[model samples]
Target: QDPFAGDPPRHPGLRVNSQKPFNAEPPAELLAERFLTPNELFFTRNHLPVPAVEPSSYRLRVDGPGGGTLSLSLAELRSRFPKHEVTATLQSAGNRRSEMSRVRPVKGLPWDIGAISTARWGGARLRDVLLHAGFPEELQGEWHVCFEGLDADPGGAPYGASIPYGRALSPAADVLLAYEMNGTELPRDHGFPVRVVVPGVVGARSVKWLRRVAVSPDEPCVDWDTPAIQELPVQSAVTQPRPGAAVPPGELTVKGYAWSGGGREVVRVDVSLDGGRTWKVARLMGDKAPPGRAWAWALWELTVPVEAGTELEIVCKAVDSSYNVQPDSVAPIWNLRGVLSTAWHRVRVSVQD
Candidate 1:
């Protein structure tokens, strides 16, 4: 009788923010340890509650403007379209909110860098489905594609979000109606039967438990009335050297991940040991996205030598292939909701003998 009763049990390693809606993120080190975040460790973001989806009976409906609609059962979705696989990172818009909250009070979960995770997604492309549903592809930039989820609020309104029709139907955009995560069927915490994987876009737009896709020429304002959170700005964060922890003086190794939106490559990450006075270029690793589609993040590492008894204000800033750099500070982009909180990630540590 309770819709929330079906919520999946989460891994204890995750740092849970809320239990009712089931929002949680993995430990910072765990996220940096692997290029592909383990399915269980991937951050789970739910607005209402996780719904129990019946895969056999589940259907995805695509609606066009002029009454044209196409419905496909779970099996039909698999057989009809070629299975597409893409490895990309999904980061919540509020990632690093906790860091922002330090400067000023904010709303929503106080997520850290762990709010972002990467995985291998397999499913049918949203473009292929749209084409089969008789949806128009020309001049799609003026239109929107709305995705509605089965999960709903206590009042019965379902969760929903939208993306530009041009992006949804463009092959280069790499939008997918995904069923598998990390080469396995999605866990209930994630979308079990099907979900939308909007590569290079904010995690919110990748609506989980997807049930319907609607195409409209006018902006529907079905969800966020503000501009959709598509590609987030370039971001990077430190994962090692827990704040306020003591570390060996000299030869301190720092680790973190750097990422950019819109398929932009994370070309370099510079680390500062003396509070941005001087910086060392970090070694980049796990850069696995295809040539132009740099959807996955690049994990980085650097070892800097510092003197003993000196407190360190370690910082990081990433540079995208286009030469876009992360802002030097958080004050400029700080907001009450703490969304898009992308500033240089900093950590304070004491170097002891």
Candidate 2:
């Protein structure tokens, strides 16, 4: 009966992105517990003070990624646009970056494991709204579907992110200007009145406290990519047998999650032991999809033979649906903010005494 008990705890195992907004990652295997991450345990990425917005006072605005402005009240959106409901798996652009960050510390939140979340979202089809708004034809070759949240950092910068344009209008895109999460109004911390759920993209782009929507032909300069904000490349983290954990000598099970940017599906996940001498392939649990902007995360697993008193260095890397593989290390991808860590996930463990 503890109301706050079901709430997400600020885990010390995480790599914190911001203190007040509270962004961090979990150890890898923690995400393999089937689909639908519990809301409390899901990662939090906020840019401004979480405003306490009343449902009666909420407003959602719309604009061309480069043009006209339109506004919708909470009621107008619910009544005017057709509702679309679908379950989607969400992942962070920083999912596996911790593995690379260890080689050299980075400046952003060091997500260790569970930065992703999956939930049934209900909202209006973004395409429907865009079409009604005349669907900006001029911005066709755009790279992303820009979004803006009401929350702001101390510097008064609003939280924001973007998804690809093709990924935006696909009838099958499953993207929504989500108003409900698991059938309830989004909690204030989660964008109470309404928010956008951009499936198969970085969680950051699923803007919370959503106030503005735009069809843009360009990538927005959010804090994650500014020179003031370091830009990291692909990176990954270990899932099974969390760091400093021990496993029985025999067959050991290793599991984790992997994702990459640019709508790519993970094609292969390789594991390494004895530092980097050799590698093995891990088992993936989901159905493989085509190579467009991949919107979901990939689950991977591997079982290895363990020896008595053996010390091990475990490593992992993933190849995208487009066959783009993760880097073996982080130097080439390292940045000041540690935004994209897609290198091999590494874990060190020992067979129990």
Candidate No. with top lDDT: 1
Candidate models: Cα lDDT each = 0.87, 0.67
> What is the per-residue lDDT of model 1 for residues 188-241, given as tens digits with 9 covering 90 to 100?
888879999999989988988988888877633266433557788899999987
User: What is candidate 2's lDDT per residue for 185-229, written digit by digit as tens?
Assistant: 776656767888876556666788887776655533353344221
Best by TM-score: 1
For candidate 2, the per-residue lDDT at 65 reads: 43
Off by over 4 Å in 2: 1-18, 26-29, 64-69, 86-89, 93-101, 136-146, 153-157, 162-167, 170-174, 182-184, 215-236, 287-293
Clashing pairs in 1: none
